[PDB]
Amino acid sequence: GRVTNQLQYLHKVVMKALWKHQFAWPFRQPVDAVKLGLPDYHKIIKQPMDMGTIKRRLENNYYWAASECMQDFNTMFTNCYIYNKPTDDIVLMAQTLEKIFLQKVASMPQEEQE
Amino acid sequence: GRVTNQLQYLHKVVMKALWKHQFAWPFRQPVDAVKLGLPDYHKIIKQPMDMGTIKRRLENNYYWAASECMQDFNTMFTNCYIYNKPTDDIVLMAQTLEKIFLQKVASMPQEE
């Protein structure tokens, strides 16, 4: 439970950009395995992650460190690559979003503090 | 070339930690589909990436920005998750290495 300059950057710069992205819609809420017809989803993916969860954690001071937040972003993207077929559009969508995520992390301010 | 603080950090902290990790050996050279009996590998993975290539690139000043090297690390990890079965050990190895990657990149100096 902490607010830092990096957490504020992850929230207000990085997440804000990804959230509004045209490929973001599948990732803004938990995967709904019922609605989507995916009865094996929770057998394969043991740690579901989504932007809504990450955003709410940033608003509620759940994270102590930027790295913790970056790990949740990574789990979200990795779940997608692991669950889905190589040829699924969703995989391309996740790669596109993940490249922005990495690009933005490369300009995160580096006085990890608060 | 002079080497930005970020690329120096990627070389001396990130690659340093990953290259010597005990889970690193599958990733140190390009995947050999012949040796590994993986006829579909190059059909699924269109951009192979490996730590030997990235390390070479870091030594020979191939990179113009940190994000470029970081993209290569990401491609290497993602290749693995896309090609391999969810239950393969290699996936667990990749995840562990990628966690270190992200942890270190969290503390990377600022650009410029």
Curated annotation (Swiss-Prot), chain A:
Family, similarity comment: Belongs to the BET family.
UniProt-reported outcome of changing Q110A: Partial loss of homodimerization
Print the miscellaneous field: Some specific inhibitors of BRD2 that prevent binding to acetylated histone are promising therapeutic molecules for the treatment of cancers or inflammatory diseases. ABBV-744, a small molecule, has been tested on tumors with success: ABBV-744 antiproliferative activity is mainly restricted to cell lines of acute myeloid leukaemia and prostate cancer and is able to displace BRD4 from chromatin. GSK046 (iBET-BD2), which specifically inhibits the second bromo domain, is a promising therapeutic small molecule for the treatment of inflammatory and autoimmune diseases.
Record text about domains: The first bromo domain specifically recognizes histone H4 acetylated at 'Lys-12' (H4K12ac). It also specifically binds histone H4 acetyl-methylated at 'Lys-5' and 'Lys-12' (H4K5acme and H4K12acme, respectively). The second bromo domain recognizes and binds histone H4 acetylated at 'Lys-5' and 'Lys-12' (H4K5ac and H4K12ac, respectively).
State the name under which the record lists this protein: Bromodomain-containing protein 2
Role noted for this protein? Chromatin reader protein that specifically recognizes and binds histone H4 acetylated at 'Lys-5' and 'Lys-12' (H4K5ac and H4K12ac, respectively), thereby controlling gene expression and remodeling chromatin structures. Recruits transcription factors and coactivators to target gene sites, and activates RNA polymerase II machinery for transcriptional elongation.
Q: Where does a protein bind?
A: D40, Y83, N84, K85, D88, D89
- Cite the record's note on assembly: Homodimer. Interacts with E2F1. Interacts with (acetylated) STAT3; promoting STAT3 recruitment to chromatin. Interacts with CTCF; promoting BRD2 recruitment to chromatin. (Microbial infection) Interacts with herpes virus 8 protein LANA1.
Full-length numbering of the shown residues: 73 to 186 of 801
Where in or outside the cell it occurs: the entry states: Nucleus; Chromosome
Q: Which residues form the Bromo domain?
A: 2-108
Mutating N84A leads to what result? Abolished binding to histone H4 acetylated at 'Lys-12' (H4K12ac). Abolished binding to histone H4 acetyl-methylated
Q: What is the effect of changing P86D?
A: Abolished binding to histone H4 acetylated at 'Lys-12' (H4K12ac)
